[PDB]
Amino acid sequence: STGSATTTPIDSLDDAYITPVQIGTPAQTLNLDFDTGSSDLWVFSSETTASEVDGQTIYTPSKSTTAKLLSGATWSISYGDGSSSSGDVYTDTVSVGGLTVTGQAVESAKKVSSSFTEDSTIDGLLGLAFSTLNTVSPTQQKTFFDNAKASLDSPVFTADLGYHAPGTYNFGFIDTTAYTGSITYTAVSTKQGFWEWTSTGYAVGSGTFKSTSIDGIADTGTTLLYLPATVVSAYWAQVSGAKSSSSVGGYVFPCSATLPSFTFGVGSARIVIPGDYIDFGPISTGSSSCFGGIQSSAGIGINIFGDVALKAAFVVFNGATTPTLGFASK
């Protein structure tokens, strides 16, 4: 089998991407944030504390003829940024882009943090990291991808995120018309449950490439590119007036600037992030200070190849017995 679904930015800054997902019978379509950095499929629901729901579409398991309470199971997740959600669990039929999984654990939120309440466009998350990170207790549950894997033509999914435009998530096949040149594959460590890999270095603008190992995760659920302070300082030093602001919470730059590109290495290949992709606009409405799309990972504990990096590439998440990641230009 295969599936193919369009993913759409939630706003004009590409702060996140939402993908329609069919849950239950008859189908209830919710727009979920596909997150390769986590492993829970959770949704706003008829069980979510009313005061914490603000415009989201909810899943109502009592209206699904295929929903079953997973008796005794609960879940609770805290994301690296400080957001959180928790609740109980149903199994139900879940379809993405024509690909159907029966018996998928659908984690119904009883509580969500304010960031989720405030994101009216995101009806939940669909985790695509390794199932070892799934938070359901006492019986850990599998991701949609893991459940689908044996049925898929090939044990892969691909992320093709757009810059200020829709893109695509494919399951079970590699669309050879969707990228230019060749796909370069690189080794993955699953030791922390993430799609963790090692970049071979970077360049700033037209500058020389610095060969250096940068271990990080491919995380579609993170907006920006978070890299070591050395690398980030070298980038922003090439933008007149750029500075790190502790009051704002990162690097800012004058909105009058033209940003250089940023290149990252994948083996002997190179992915170029255009300067425009690194512009996240005024820090507040009307400000002439703009927020940077490359930020320091110091304090996070891990480097994160978020949407800023991933949307410059066609990315293959290869879930074969020995997983790998593939990157191509597009």
UniProtKB/Swiss-Prot annotation:
Q: Name one GO biological process term.
A: proteolysis
Top-level division of the source organism's lineage:
Eukaryota
Q: Which cysteines are joined by disulfide bonds?
A: 255-290
Give every Peptidase A1 domain span.
Answer: 17-328
Gene name linked to the record:
EAPA
The similarity comment for this entry is:
Belongs to the peptidase A1 family.
Listed under catalytic activity are: Hydrolysis of proteins with specificity similar to that of pepsin A, prefers hydrophobic residues at P1 and P1', but does not cleave 14-Ala-|-Leu-15 in the B chain of insulin or Z-Glu-Tyr. Clots milk
Task: Write out the GO MF terms.
Answer: aspartic-type endopeptidase activity
Q: Which UniProt keywords apply?
A: Aspartyl protease, Disulfide bond, Hydrolase, Protease, Signal, Zymogen
Q: What is this protein called?
A: Endothiapepsin
**Known EC number(s)?**
3.4.23.22
Locate the active site: 35, 199
Is Cell membrane included in the keywords of this UniProt record?
no
Asked whether the UniProt record includes Protease among its keywords, one would answer yes
